[PDB]
Amino acid sequence: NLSDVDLSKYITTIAGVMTLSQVKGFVRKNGVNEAKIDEIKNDNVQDTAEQKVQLLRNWHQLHGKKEAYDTLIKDLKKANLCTLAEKIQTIILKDITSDSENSNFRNEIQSLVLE
């Protein structure tokens, strides 16, 4: 009855934490051929959010849990690690080249890893 609503809420949550290109990249690596992508891309020309959800939906219904988990977790892990690296580098270069105090550095880092 609510199987598909809960699946939708879940896949929407993953969609919201990935960019369209990032989703396209991931699903391409894990069994969604450029055929299916284009079909999805032309069904939602205005709606890029729905594009990500359909792409992930198509990917999701192709895989054993252990594979779907490992693959997605790995993907998010690397994306996270790159963004952390970019954001922390920016803070550091900003503060290392400033003449004022940066009593905000600790707070800044802590917010990037809030849990």
Binding site: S3, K9, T13, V17, L76, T83, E115
Partner: protein
């Protein structure tokens, strides 16, 4: 906070399933409540999981943290789900700044 716990809940709901009562127990959800959740939502396993979490959030207004959700998951050997909740939370932390 609010939206973070929602994100976590959506990940947990659609991925826990069979051993949800084990998870409810780790969230210090009483058996008196777990019996009633079995009664309220006999149809969908996913709906039972959600209400268990909702009770937990109402049980600590200020201390219902994703960090503690992840501890709960890991203590029931639901590690892959914990991993995914962590990575989504971390992803979300990195958007607040850019987005």
């Amino acid at each position: 906070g609010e939206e973070d716990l929602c994100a976590a809940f959506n990940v947990i709901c659609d991925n826990v399933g069979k051993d949800w009562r084990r998870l409810a127990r780790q969230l210090k959800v009483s058996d008196t409540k777990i019996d009633s959740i079995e009664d309220r939502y006999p149809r969908n396993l996913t709906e039972r999981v959600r209400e268990s979490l909702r009770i937990w959030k109402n049980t600590e207004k200020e201390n219902a943290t994703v960090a503690h959700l992840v501890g709960a998951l890991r203590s029931c050997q639901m590690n892959l789900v914990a991993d995914l909740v962590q990575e989504v939370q971390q992803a979300r932390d990195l958007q607040n700044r850019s987005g």
